[PDB]
Ligand binder design. Sequence first.
Ligand SMILES: CCN(C(=O)c1cc(F)ccc1Oc1nncnc1N1CC2(CCN(CC3(C)CC3)CC2)C1)C(C)C
Length: 462
Amino acid sequence: GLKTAQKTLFPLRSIDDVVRLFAAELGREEPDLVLLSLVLGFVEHFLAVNRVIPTNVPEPSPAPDPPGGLTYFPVADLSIIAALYARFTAQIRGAVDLPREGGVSSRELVKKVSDVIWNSLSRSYFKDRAHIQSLFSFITGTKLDSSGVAFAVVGACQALGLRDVHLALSEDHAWVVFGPNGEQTAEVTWHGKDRRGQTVNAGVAERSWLYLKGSYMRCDRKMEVAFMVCAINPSIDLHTDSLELLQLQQKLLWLLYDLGHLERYPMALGNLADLEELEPTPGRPDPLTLYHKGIASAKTYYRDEHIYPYMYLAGYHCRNRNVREALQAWADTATVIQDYNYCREDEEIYKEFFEVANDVIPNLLKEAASLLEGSALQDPECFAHLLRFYDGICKWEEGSPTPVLHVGWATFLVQSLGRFEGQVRQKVRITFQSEKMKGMKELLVATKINSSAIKLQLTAQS
Ligand SMILES: CCN(C(=O)c1cc(F)ccc1Oc1nncnc1N1CC2(CCN(CC3(C)CC3)CC2)C1)C(C)C
């Protein structure tokens, strides 16, 4: 049952209409997670899933076709959004047996709301596909990706008036927290390419990156809106994004930023900065300000145990040919990961470190050498930052149940070391933390790089 004020905004015919509807909803003490997620899913379906008009642009009279191409919007009728809203609420309300004396919900209650979402999904589909994140995908396709399940469970709880069930976010996983002050936890979805019903205590005690040693985000309803905005997927295919969905996500994040709802959301600040890098909004903070905001947010609220705030910043410096600053920010990234244990389900962050060490840094140093042929390659500080990055990775691996470094890592390490002349490398005096890097300190600074020896040393088991 949509309140009358919710009804007046429709029909949404523009991006701003969506923004006004988000603006209107964020003013309430509890914004409608189902209504908001349906609208974004409807908009994204007809902009990215079912692309109505092609995206290509043609090469004294007017041109026969729009010479720059076309953007469009699928009008969201009240009748159509409300019909879908009614389907979900009729589904959820008839499925759970509603005392909750303290405004808190039982573990067995959260479990059957979770079970109602879980058992509504198709048994076979590709969990990693795009555009199955929203309640629109749930109700019209019975398909949800991993964190989409957790979000749907949270939206179902708001539908049943369980103000105490909230979305919990690590950097790669989602679950629910509940109880008098968010102290119980329950897994509600799978992770990886499931532990449903269990707490996350074991994973927090595991010191795996997946559970951030307990320094994860406990969302309020306002950050749960920020999550579904971050979850907007503009990809039409791998080489094509929808300009409309990028613009919508960007204006929505600015709306959330102005209301203060990204203050505890480092990844969302980083997402906004990345959008701002491609499409600056006049009068707004530049991307670097926003990257440093996300880092300050991670330091303030999650005691500096997040990884992505630093790779956001490092990526921006890399794309802008700021070699010193990019190397320093990847060193700081490795400095956070070195206090984690590399565990079974941490493959996402491994993949990102792999790409940095074995693609991004090699490319950055090659770029710098083309200028050389002052410069970063002549700066011992830059070499020290490179070694600090590898030292953190080795410390991360040390004592973990999963190996990190393999022979391919050694190949790129030897290459990156070679980018610094021996006279530069011999100026550093470094204290390493990892046993692996200590066991080749002298081999890293020698005038002649011993590739086989460094390869042997980088690949010794932890
Ligand atoms: C990307 C889709 N998505 C997730 O995957 C997800 C799932 C979870 F259960 C928990 C955190 C999750 O991630 C995020 N949650 N909220 C805001 N934004 C997030 N993401 C940005 C992201 C990390 C940073 N890289 C960029 C680099 C490496 C440059 C810094 C891009 C991908 C992940 C969510 C938005 C639905």
